[PDB]
Amino acid sequence: EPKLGQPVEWTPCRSKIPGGALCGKLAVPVDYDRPDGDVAALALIRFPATGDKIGSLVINPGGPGESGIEAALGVFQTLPKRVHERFDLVGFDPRGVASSRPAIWCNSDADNDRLRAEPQVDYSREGVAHIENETKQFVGRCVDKMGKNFLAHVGTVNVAKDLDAIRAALGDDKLTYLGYSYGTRIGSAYAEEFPQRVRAMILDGAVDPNADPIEAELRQAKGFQDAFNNYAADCAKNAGCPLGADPAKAVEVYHSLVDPLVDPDNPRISRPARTKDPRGLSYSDAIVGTIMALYSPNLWQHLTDGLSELVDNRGDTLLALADMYMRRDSHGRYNNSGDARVAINCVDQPPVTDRDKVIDEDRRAREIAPFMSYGKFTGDAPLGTCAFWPVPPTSQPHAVSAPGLVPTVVVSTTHDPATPYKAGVDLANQLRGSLLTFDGTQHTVVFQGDSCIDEYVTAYLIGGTTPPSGAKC
Ligand SMILES: *[C@](O)(C(=O)OC)[C@H](C[C@@H]1CC=NC1=O)NC(=O)[C@H](CCCCN)NC(=O)[C@H](Cc1ccccc1)NC(=O)O
């Protein structure tokens, strides 16, 4: 095990790994107010630079709960040549995530499978009570396996402190950071606590820390409905579209394909589409699979395949897309990204506990994103998991305040479903940095094949040149 204050012991990484990758662990205190107490071990991966090294480019894929080691292995394949020359590509698993120890675990593989088999559409009083009873048992499993102390200190406020310890452990006087999705919350949290330690920062797919949680969720529901509409309009131009040639009826045709997966007389009964997998395709997995495909047009073909299969009451592709979102491998084993996502989210802001607010949010969500709403508004809706969380939040919604921060770049995609375009405009305003706009219907874009975007962030990472005002790719 690594000890507090000890240098990172690098070694060639485990089971082929490219680019002479080095792996190691850094010890951080669980509670920064008690560095004498318990210690967490953060897993790191490192791809040494091939040319004149400026420093380390630390990345985070977001989630929260997504592995940064896994992400750095993917980014290494699409890393521009000049970035690979001047920077060590460094990924890290945040505290409680993936290979970091202790890792957040709440649900067994069967607990996740059992939930996904349920339609999760019954919002009657009995249905809401059933959902909240499962939620209370989920929270109990988190406490039993993790303990309240570690769950209390897993928030982004402590990840930002870990990120500075990572910067010093990597030998960099200042941090060069690329954050995707939730990684932009790590970025802004780090920018507020260590503004004097930021050399460069790129935030792709922005979350606004000043946002109200309800309105942000409804803006994300609108983003996924807009992405659904863009996918359906594209499919309508193509031969044999399973949603028909009229995009104005695509939501109706979509529901004619997914609604039969629920028993029309008993919303608690699943009628799953046939798959080679023994699970079949539940309604909830069909919706999750659709959401997964709407993250990128590279998956739109898979959504079309999944819906054509549903015409014949098959659900193999949509089940695979749902497995991709939930990170369930071919042997039925989940990674801890799902459980880590909940535990990190529940401490990053005060949860919504008002019943009227939760009910009214479901009423508006049904109207805003009809594609992922079943049946009619019932007058009731379940509270989220965080409303039952046993440890208090360690961050509060606020506008990012880092006055002396170096110019940064926020990359925002016009029709991003997961983090809408306006969220990136608002974050760039709070950071008082540059906004780089990408025109598309996808979530994140940096280092993913677009030379316009990549040449912008390459010049920023190396020379500090920010894109001009109104830059579009
Ligand atoms: C970003 O971190 C990402 O894409 O991670 C890979 C992103 C950022 C969040 C969006 C709003 N605030 C954030 O912090 N996270 C996500 O998109 C997560 C993780 C994806 C799963 C990968 N294993 N999921 C959602 O945000 C989710 C999307 C959704 C909408 C409607 C139905 C079902 C899912 N929405 C949610 O948690 O409310």
Automatic annotation (TrEMBL):
Keywords of this entry: Hydrolase, Protease, Signal
Pfam families assigned to the protein according to its UniProt record, in alphabetical order: Abhydrolase_1
EC primary class: hydrolase
GO biological process, one term: proteolysis
InterPro entries given in the database record: AB_hydrolase_1 (IPR000073), AB_hydrolase_fold (IPR029058), Serine_prot/Carboxylest_S33 (IPR051601)
Keyword Iron set for record: no
Domain AB hydrolase-1 per the UniProt entry, residue ranges: 57-449
Domain of life, per lineage: Bacteria
GO molecular function list: peptidase activity
E.C. number: 3.4.-.-, 3.4.14.-
Family under the similarity heading: Belongs to the peptidase S33 family.
UniProt protein name: Protease
Native organism: Mycobacterium tuberculosis
